[PDB]
Design a protein around this ligand. Sequence first.
Ligand SMILES: Cc1cc2nc3c(=O)[nH]c(=O)nc-3n(C[C@H](O)[C@H](O)[C@H](O)COP(=O)(O)O)c2cc1C
Length: 366
Amino acid sequence: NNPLFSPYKMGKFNLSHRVVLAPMTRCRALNNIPQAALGEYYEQRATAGGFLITEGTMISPTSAGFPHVPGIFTKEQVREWKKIVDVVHAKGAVIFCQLWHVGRASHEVYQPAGAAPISSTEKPISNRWRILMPDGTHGIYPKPRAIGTYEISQVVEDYRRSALNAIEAGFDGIEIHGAHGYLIDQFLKDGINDRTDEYGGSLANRCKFITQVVQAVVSAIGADRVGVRVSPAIDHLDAMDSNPLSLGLAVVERLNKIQLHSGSKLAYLHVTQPGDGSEEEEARLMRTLRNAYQGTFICSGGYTRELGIEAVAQGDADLVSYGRLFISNPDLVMRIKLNAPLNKYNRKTFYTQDPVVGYTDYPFLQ
Ligand SMILES: Cc1cc2nc3c(=O)[nH]c(=O)nc-3n(C[C@H](O)[C@H](O)[C@H](O)COP(=O)(O)O)c2cc1C
């Protein structure tokens, strides 16, 4: 009866249901190397024909702003990801790697040689926000270095090489992290991008970086293995746009044009929202971006079982991603299918390093 359990064709991938694991940073990938613990964690959540998105994954030595997040820029990282991808595929699941650059949302402790983080801008995140340090304290975001356009093209190549590494590890595809005030969003949002060259100012200029990143990974691995995540109206790390709907529609137009020029559709567009009870206004934004995009749409942010069912039933979205409920409900798909009670999550262990505690020790349904 439940449309969340109707099958869906995501490009080449035949999904058996519409419940998606949203990407979440958990900081168990010690020294940026995927660990056996990650394999247990993703395997617990994998289902036959279900779609998983990994935690954000570094594309370069300078792309991190969290401790013990995995990378996919070295061959050592590729070898260890392969072991995780294999156990997920042994469950019949489809898995994409999220490619993540934090831009100015970093700190000397996270950068090679303690160098400054990079951004569209030379302005620091304001002291309204604090960065989680490796010792569990909260530190001050430093002044970033505004990069020139050659360096922009080098970052684009980091995305491209990371996408090829993800394919080498056996991932089904990659997702571009263009959300939450990180590097791509620092170019998109006119509340951050103060550039006066061809990457700042107009909507077209502000959309150049995400267009070039998506085009590069499309050319390398094929559009149907590329998803794109954005958040036009999440206020995180001083990310704000004067006209969020207009910015979101401008991004969607770029994606439609990339598809037209390459003769193929992307895997999906993934839009995430605050989702913390603004409900009607947020729902209208989500539906407006979905209606403008020629392809598969994943909605994200505060969805419940009931709101996910409604989203698919009403044609508002094709797939529904869940984040926090998947932390504490490894069998979330099954609980949603059965309408079984959901278990709470322990916020304290979202970002700790233990390979079991708060990570793989949340039980299945009895
Ligand atoms: C601990 C935690 C880590 C997260 N890490 C990421 C991440 O690496 N990349 C990303 O795009 N979103 C990340 N998110 C955001 C989630 O993917 C999701 O969009 C958000 O939690 C809202 O969905 P929900 O209400 O279902 O939890 C994270 C969220 C949490 C709580």
